[PDB]
From a paper:
Both E3s are positive regulators of TGFβ signalling because they mediate the attachment of degradative ﻿ubiquitin chains and subsequent destruction of negative regulators of the TGFβ pathway, such as SMAD7 and SnoN/Ski. Previously we reported that the RING domains of Arkadia and Ark2C are bona fide ﻿ubiquitin-binding domains, and that docking of the RING domain onto a regulatory ﻿ubiquitin molecule (UbR) enhances ﻿ubiquitin transfer. Most E3s possess a RING (Really Interesting New Gene) domain that binds the thioester linked E2~﻿ubiquitin (E2~Ub) conjugate and brings it into close proximity with the substrate. ﻿ubiquitin is then typically transferred directly from the E2 to a lysine residue in the substrate.
Guided by the structure of UbR bound to the RING domain we prepared a fusion protein (referred to as UbArk2C) in which ﻿ubiquitin was linked to the N-terminus of the RING domain of Ark2C (residues 255–346). Ubiquitin transfer by UbArk2C was increased compared to Ark2C RING alone in both discharge and multi-turnover assays suggesting that ﻿ubiquitin occupies the UbR binding site. Crystals that diffracted to 2.5 Å were obtained and the structure was solved by molecular replacement, with residues 1–74 of ﻿ubiquitin positioned, as well as residues 259–274 and 288–344 of Ark2C. Comparison of the UbArk2C structure with previous structures of the Ark2C–RING bound to ﻿ubiquitin reveals a high degree of similarity.
Numbering used by the authors: 0 to 74, 86, 255 to 274, 289 to 342
Amino acid sequence: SMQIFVKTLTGKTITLEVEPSDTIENVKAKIQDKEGIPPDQQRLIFAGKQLEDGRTLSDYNIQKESTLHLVLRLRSGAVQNTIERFTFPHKYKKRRDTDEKCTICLSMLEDGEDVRRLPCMHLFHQLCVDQWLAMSKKCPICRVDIETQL
Ligand SMILES: [Zn+2]
Ligand SMILES: [Zn+2]
């Protein structure tokens, strides 16, 4: 086995015990196992290109100690439209630790709740974080602008 690194926009780095013959889908799956991010929300970038799910790491030049970037899989204050364009709204599904709390209101996230992931990968209740973003388009935790790109 071997190890590779996955970095978010905050500089946070995750270590992944992988195989060279693992699919990008499997990589997103262990990212979900470690950090609870659904694979449909993850866009992995490596060397300035996007990484398709049905392909293997060893297709893509992923040796030991390689670092991929984990961006948000998207298609001053921010208006509601700006917020939707730069974040991932969804209903929460607890995965079978597994507990996550909205750091604004301190309540646990429950199945079905309207939640929002920001491009830094931080996750909140929609109701809690939209009030914040209408005041300042930065993440309350890490202060990353919801429009920053790369
Ligand atoms: Zn909340
Ligand atoms: Zn953040």
